[PDB]
Design a protein around this ligand. Structure first.
Ligand SMILES: O=c1cc[nH]c(=O)[nH]1
Length: 223
DNA sequence: TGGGGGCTT
DNA sequence: AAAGCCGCCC
């Protein structure tokens, strides 16, 4: 059907008519008529197409999409075949390997598996100019993504959130630490993986917390 | 073989 | 806000 999944549109609809958003889309479109922008128009909101807002249990949040051609497709750190898993997804794979013994490198970079399971693969800023990192930062995405988190926070229980990287962690000060389990760590990029990511064991810690709260855990190899 | 965050000034 | 300094696997 369309760009936004039913539940998501329904619950984020209140944002559409807000000036910050109007102008924002205005900005992005302009951008497009003058520069290559990722992810392409139809893919900016893939994260809403993967599962109903009502049954999202975990929220992995990154900063901006891959400013490289063929990478950014709507789900954070994910690349659709026949594109290979970029550094960030390789580092994520290294951890998963050690963290979850049942897990083995799946041979591709599509994260739709987790997504369909109830993992919101969000990103703070949803679009980026070709070959130019941080270009669409502070244009309105943050407030929109703030809106996403905000809602999820107010209307859910036991959401396990994974805030990877400083910019991502900024959102943490809007999550009720009592009802929701929050885990932080360095962004998986080569440039920042050694500062904590490697060894965090978020994935396992996640199934733990989720099982504890009486909810089916995640099958991290099912992707 | 160099392009892929985190913190300071 | 912009720019510099630093950091690092197979
Ligand atoms: O989608 C992606 C890729 C890299 N870094 C992020 O924060 N998100």
């Amino acid at each position: 059907m369309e760009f936004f999944g039913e539940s998501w549109k329904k619950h984020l609809s209140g944002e559409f008519g807000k000036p910050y958003f109007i102008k924002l889309m205005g900005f992005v479109a302009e951008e497009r008529k003058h520069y290559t922008v990722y992810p392409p128009p139809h893919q900016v909101f893939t994260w809403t197409q993967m599962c109903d807002i009502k049954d999202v249990k975990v929220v992995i949040l990154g900063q901006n999409p891959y400013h490289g051609p063929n990478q950014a497709h709507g789900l954070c750190f994910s690349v659709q075949r026949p594109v290979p898993p970029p550094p960030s997804l390789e580092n994520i794979y290294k951890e998963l390997s050690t963290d979850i013994e049942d897990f083995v490198h799946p041979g591709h970079g599509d994260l739709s598996g987790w997504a369909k399971q109830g993992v919101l693969l969000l990103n703070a800023v949803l679009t980026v100019r070709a070959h130019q990192a941080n270009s669409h930062k502070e244009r309105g995405w943050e407030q929109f993504t703030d809106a996403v988190v905000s809602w999820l926070n107010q209307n859910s229980n036991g959401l396990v959130f994974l805030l990877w990287g400083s910019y991502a962690q900024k959102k943490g000060s809007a999550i009720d630490r009592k009802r929701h389990h929050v885990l932080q760590t360095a962004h998986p990029s080569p440039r920042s993986v050694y500062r904590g990511f490697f060894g965090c064991r978020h994935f396992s810690k996640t199934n733990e917390l989720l099982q504890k709260s009486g909810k089916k855990p995640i099958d991290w190899k099912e992707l």
